[PDB]
């Protein structure tokens, strides 16, 4: 067979140890999920420095904690806008997930609080910026570079899926690089606890699995499809399915045809054909062998999964870092003061936050 006796015994023991780790992590998650934390700080505990990102949600600012001097990223949400945008459940869900999970590649929520006008989530500051920016600048990542990031996503999804969480929002825009060159996942608004199937149309066109586009009930296998898109885009510099308009992207996604750059290795093409598999009965991550079909694929043969988890692998790329509070890996945004109304807005809706 492919493995001699020593290699087969080592792989078997390793897979059993994963099961043991995940069973304990689920126990710890469910304790925190059932008893969340709240009201662990207030606004005048921090100096606000610079906007790091903006969206329909609100904005994220670099802040400095007065007592400790530590820097953090503070997400500020306007309650009235969250309601108008129909995002109450997503916002409460994001906070509940973030306070309950624990994994080296998931961003840590350090504080949360609210006032008359806004909701606040204070997360560790990840100074390296978005993977998106580095990828467009460099052009593409080498296969070893892409593989180092991919391994972290595989382990992160193995963790989340064991908790029955589907992620649904994978793309380079949503992945940050930390000071040691490792990945941080931050956004959980679209994540959902689902043991079986769910039906919401959500995600980003280039990264949508066919069964979402086709308005089917779907499961955690959509995350393994999206991993295939991410690996492709990291290694090529562009995604596998693109066009001028989303409907044309969707036609390509559901077609079952994908084409590769000539510089892709055969091992990479084989993995990607098995992740970008339209037939759910054949997609890696969705078979009897589960995540092991991915982790044991030839393209990952040089990956030491425990060493990645322990953060003992030397990263291929370390972002520029001039000191704490350095914001040079993020964009510049028009600053806008944060007003707090004399009148509480939307109290009932956000009573659990």
């Amino acid at each position: 067979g492919h493995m001699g006796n020593a290699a087969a015994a080592k792989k078997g023991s390793e897979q059993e140890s994963v099961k043991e780790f995940l069973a304990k992590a689920k126990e710890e998650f469910l304790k925190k999920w059932e008893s969340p934390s709240q009201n662990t700080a207030q606004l005048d505990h921090f100096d606000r420095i610079k906007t790091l990102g903006t969206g329909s949600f609100g904005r994220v600012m670099l802040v400095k904690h007065k007592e400790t001097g530590n820097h953090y990223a503070m997400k500020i949400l306007d309650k009235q806008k969250v309601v108008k945008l129909k995002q109450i459940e997503h916002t409460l869900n994001e906070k509940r997930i973030l306070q309950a999970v624990n994994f080296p590649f998931l961003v840590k929520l350090e504080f949360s609080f609210k006032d008359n006008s806004n909701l606040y989530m204070v997360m560790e500051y990840v100074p390296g910026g978005e993977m998106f920016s580095h990828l467009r600048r460099i052009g593409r990542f080498s296969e070893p570079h892409a593989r180092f990031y991919a391994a972290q996503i595989v382990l992160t999804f193995e963790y989340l899926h064991s908790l029955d969480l589907i992620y649904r929002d994978l793309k380079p825009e949503n992945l940050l690089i930390d000071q040691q060159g490792y990945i941080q996942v931050t956004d959980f608004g679209f994540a959902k606890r689902v043991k079986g199937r769910t039906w919401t149309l959500c995600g980003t066109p280039e990264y949508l699995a066919p069964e979402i586009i086709l308005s089917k009930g779907y499961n955690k296998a959509v995350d393994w499809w999206a991993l295939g898109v991410l690996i492709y885009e990291m290694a090529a510099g562009y995604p596998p399915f693109f066009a001028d308009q989303p409907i044309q992207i969707y036609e390509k996604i559901v077609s079952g045809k994908v084409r590769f750059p000539s510089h892709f290795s055969s091992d990479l093409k084989d993995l990607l054909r098995n992740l970008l598999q339209v037939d759910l009965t054949k997609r890696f991550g969705n078979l009897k062998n589960g995540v092991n079909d991915i982790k044991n694929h030839k393209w990952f043969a040089t990956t030491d999964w425990i060493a990645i988890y322990q953060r003992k692998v030397e990263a291929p790329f370390i972002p520029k870092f001039k000191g704490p509070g350095d914001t040079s890996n993020f964009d510049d945004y028009e600053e806008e003061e944060i007003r707090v109304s004399i009148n509480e807005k939307c109290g009932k809706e956000f009573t659990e936050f």
């Binding site: 929002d169 679209f190 980003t204 066109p205 510099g237 001028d244 750059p261």
Partner: peptide, 20 residues
Amino acid sequence: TTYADFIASGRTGRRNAIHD
């Protein structure tokens, strides 16, 4: 080239989710 087609798509910047 495929790269040229990607530039021509106009979707080289940050991509929004559907709900936006």
